Structure 1
Amino acid sequence: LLIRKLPFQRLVREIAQDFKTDLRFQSSAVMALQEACEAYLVGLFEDTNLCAIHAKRVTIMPKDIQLARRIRGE
């Protein structure tokens, strides 16, 4: 994994608090969410790098994430 596990667990337990208070998570639910979130972010930066090369650049910019998410339908 590439994100640290304890701040990602704090992030899931502070996002899920808005949906139902006082929830518990299995130890493998947080690792499934962390595996799916890095498999989402790498697949997002692979299209952001395509949108940055498309403009004849190397540095990715927030408009490249915004284009890769508007084309994808997000």
Structure 2
Amino acid sequence: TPSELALYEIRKYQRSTDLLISKIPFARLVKEVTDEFTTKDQDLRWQSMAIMALQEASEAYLVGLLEHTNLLALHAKRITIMKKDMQLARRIRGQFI
């Protein structure tokens, strides 16, 4: 059952209490973002714990925006989200757009 399996999947990671992005990717991503933001001479270290908190804030915001963008698609009487759709959802939420 495609719908049954995928909806069950929503519910199980919906009630899962934990972060879910790939980790070594996320860590190297923040590392290179700091490296490019930082310059020639001053370089910055990262422990486990900062990377932690960064991750949780990113997860929480993107999931919140995710229900909102899903909802703007629902308001379009559809179930795909698009560029314009979410672009807007976020931008209506205001920050960073």
TM-score of the superposed pair, with normalisation by structure 1:
0.90
2:92 is matched with which residue: 65, 71, 74?
71
Who is 1:44 aligned against? 65
Who is 1:33 aligned against? 54
Q: Which runs of 4+ in 1 moved over 6 A?
A: none
Kindly indicate whether structure 1 or structure 2 has the higher relative contact order, using CA contacts under 8 Å at least 6 residues apart. 1
Higher strand share goes to which structure? 1
Number of residue pairs aligned between Structure 1 and Structure 2 = 74
The answer for unaligned runs of 5 or more in structure 1 is: none
Who is 1:24 aligned against? 45
TM-score of the superposed pair, with normalisation by structure 2:
0.70
User: What do residues 4-58 of structure 1 show as CA deviations (whole Å, max 9, x unaligned)?
Assistant: 1110011101111122243110111001111111101100111101100111001
Q: Distance in 2 between matches of 1:59 and 1:18?
A: 34
Q: CA shift at 1:70, angstroms?
A: 1.7
1:2 is matched with which residue: 8, 20, 45?
20
What is the SS of the residue equivalent to 2:57? helix
The answer for unaligned runs of 5 or more in structure 2 is: 1-18
Larger radius of gyration between Structure 1 and Structure 2? 2
